[PDB]
Design a protein that fits this description.
The chain is α+β, with helices and mostly antiparallel strands. The protein has two domains: 1-265, no CATH class; 266-330, Barwin-like endoglucanases (Beta Barrel). It contains nine helices and 15 strands. It has helices spanning 14-23, 35-50, 138-153, 177-181, 191-200, 212-217, 226-235, 260-263, 309-315; strands spanning 4-8, 60-67, 73-80, 91-101, 106-116, 123-130, 161-165, 205-206, 238-243, 250-255, 266-272, 278-283, 292-297, 305-307, 322-327. The chain is globular, with a radius of gyration of 21 Å. The protein starts with a strand and ends with a strand. It binds calcium ion (CA). The site of calcium ion has 5 residues, from loops. InterPro entries: Acyl_CoA_acyltransferase, Arg/Orn_succinylTfrase_asu, Arg_succinylTrfase_AstA/AruG. Pfam families: AstA. Pathway: Amino-acid degradation; L-arginine degradation via AST pathway; L-glutamate and succinate from L-arginine: step 1/5.
Amino acid sequence: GHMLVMRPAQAADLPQVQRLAADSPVGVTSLPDDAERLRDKILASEASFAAEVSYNGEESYFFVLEDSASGELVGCSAIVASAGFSEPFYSFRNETFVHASRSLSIHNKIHVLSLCHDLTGNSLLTSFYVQRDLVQSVYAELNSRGRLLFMASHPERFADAVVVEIVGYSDEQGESPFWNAVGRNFFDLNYIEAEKLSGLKHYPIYVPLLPDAAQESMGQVHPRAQITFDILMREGFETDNYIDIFDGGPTLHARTSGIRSIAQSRVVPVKIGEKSGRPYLVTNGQLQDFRAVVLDLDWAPGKPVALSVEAAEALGVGEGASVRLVAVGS
Ligand SMILES: [Ca+2]
């Protein structure tokens, strides 16, 4: 019985963000359980939001979902404006080549993994986490897609395409088949240790030569990340031929013109003071004072959005304001 409100991360959020980070999968290294890294993450976001008339691609935007009554943070998510701006964004490219056997007349098409940084410049969705009780709720939708609404309101700050690397598969002892078959052979840490290390901080590989379990794990997600994957599938993202260099998790991609919560979002005037319908994700369209909530509205294009006094307070909007909204849908 409390409203949840999405807003930019604030410095004083650090201990609450650390709690989220500690509960998130270790393979979500964009949300490391490390005070120093999280402080840097929040500072970077604060700088990005604060510079309201300048941006150059170095930016990142870190959002938290807050219980408006208690102040408890129950989720978080982030956007990186330009993948690889400061340090290269590495992936394995899954590519094919054909080895011609002249004497057999076989032209054998073979998959290989090649270390690369092809995804540079794309905007990147990262750091997604919600508490267990928000899984498969409109609030998980808000926590993820509120970033997309933000991107719709500020298109110039971001690329025309978005990528997301979903945490790969590891079992309930924290063993990653892909890590064990690949990276661990070059640096013998277990997966959890390698990801903890990744958090706190060249020739092709033949796919046919990898163990079956590792092959099967390529492009698979951590069970706890299926929610994240599914939200994005409904948004219009599709898997791309790049996988994580540690765990082989899939990379998703979409053009902004084809992302539901960008392309189908609308800017609408409000009328404040007073019905049931269906859930909408609603933002105030602002930068530093960005706010987003889920509202049950009886609304359609062509009329103003009717907001309650409570909803307008949460959104930080008043008379004559506009909001950006999109149906949660299905
Ligand atoms: Ca990853």
